[PDB]
Amino acid sequence: TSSSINFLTRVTGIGPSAARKFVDEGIKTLEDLRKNEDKLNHHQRIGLKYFEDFEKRIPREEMLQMQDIVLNEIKKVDSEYIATVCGSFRRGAESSGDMDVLLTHPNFTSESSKQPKLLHRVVEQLQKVHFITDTLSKGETKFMGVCQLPSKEYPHRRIDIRLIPKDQYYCGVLYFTGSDIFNKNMRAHALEKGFTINEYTIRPRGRTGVAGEPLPVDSEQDIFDYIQWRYREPKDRSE
């Protein structure tokens, strides 16, 4: 049934195709999934383990404590790391759905060699202090996992950590801070001024529609400056 399909897609790790396959096999509820662990991959098994926790909102007060821990532990690994918790949290929201950490380091640029250890050492330190409790998926530049505040215990929470080349970092912070409407409005203004902004770069685009090389960006302010917008504090980026 289509209701069952959409329900199953609420488990992280289960997409539409996976949900359709499960329903076809008579697996429709959380209890059904829990009775069929042998049919799940790791991402689905962990997403199921914390299904209830993951649907809870995260109070801002907890997000602050989570941020403070993450930034502190990162600094311990290497003081040259730069890390920013983005999303609606960065805009000052009173609650969050998850924690999205953007990470960079001067040694990692869009021209240097790939450096997955820059990410893995941070994940490992956060595991050592028992902040990160489970992994959903881990690659060379992106970690998707589970974390929990030190304790009555707190709910487990979704955390992503993304390793971004330094020369693309503040475009990433801008993009993942949003809001979606603010990003849309800012991209549109950039176009009026002869620029294209995406998750990675700001580039001039000439009258012939051809894009030039990425422009240097050392801060969010640089991006606002290129398109002649006054800097907007994240809390003022609802639109």
Cβ burial, residue 69 (10 Å; 0-12/13-18/19+): middle
Torsion of CA 193, 196, 202, 204, to 10 degrees: -60
Retrieve residue 150's tokens: 């030190």
Of 25, 55, 85, which residue constitutes the final position of a domain? 55
Same-domain status, 192 and 180: yes
Same-domain status, 75 and 47: no
Binding-site residues for a 2'-deoxyribonucleoside 5'-triphosphate, in ranges, read 57, 88, 91, 97-98
Of the candidates 51, 54, 52, 2, the residue with the CA atom closest to the CA atom of residue 28: 2
Same-domain status, 72 and 144: yes
Retrieve residue 8's tokens: 């199953």
Asked if 226 and 215 touch (Cβ cutoff 8 Å), the reply is yes
Binding-site residues, in ranges, read 9, 11, 14, 57, 88, 91, 97-98, 100, 160
Q: What range defines the domain where residue 145 resides? A: 58-169
Residue type for position 104: T
Asked if 138 and 144 touch (Cβ cutoff 8 Å), the reply is yes
Same-domain status, 65 and 165: yes
Binding-site residues for K(+), in ranges, read 9, 11, 14
Same-domain status, 146 and 77: yes
Same-domain status, 69 and 161: yes
Same-domain status, 64 and 152: yes
Of 123, 144, 169, which residue constitutes the final position of a domain? 169
Residue 31: which CATH number? Answer: 1.10.150.20
Of the candidates 127, 169, 122, 163, the residue with the CA atom closest to the CA atom of residue 148: 127
Binding-site residues for Mg(2+), in ranges, read 98, 100, 160
- Going by their DSSP bridges, the two strands 82-85 and 142-147 should be labelled as unpaired
d(CA 115, CA 139): 11
Of 120, 143, 169, which residue constitutes the final position of a domain? 169
Residue 196: which CATH number? Answer: 3.30.210.10
Binding-site residues for Na(+), in ranges, read 9, 11, 14
User: If you search the block for the tokens 């685009």, which residue do you land on?
Assistant: 205
Same-domain status, 62 and 153: yes
SS (H, E, C) the chain: CHHHHHHHCCCCCCCHHHHHHHHHCCCCCHHHHHCCHHHCCHHHHHHHHCHHHHCCCEEHHHHHHHHHHHHHHHHHHCCCCEEEECHHHHCCCCEECCEEEEEECCCCCCCCCCCCHHHHHHHHHHHHCCCEEEEEEECCCEEEEEECCCCCCCCCEEEEEEECCHHHHHHHHHHHHCCHHHHHHHHHHHHHCCEEECCCCEEEECCCCCECCCCCCCCHHHHHHHCCCCCCCHHHCCC
Domain count, the chain: 3
Residue 122: which CATH number? Answer: 3.30.460.10
Of the candidates 152, 154, 172, 153, the residue with the CA atom closest to the CA atom of residue 162: 172
d(CA 139, CA 124): 13
Same-domain status, 159 and 189: no
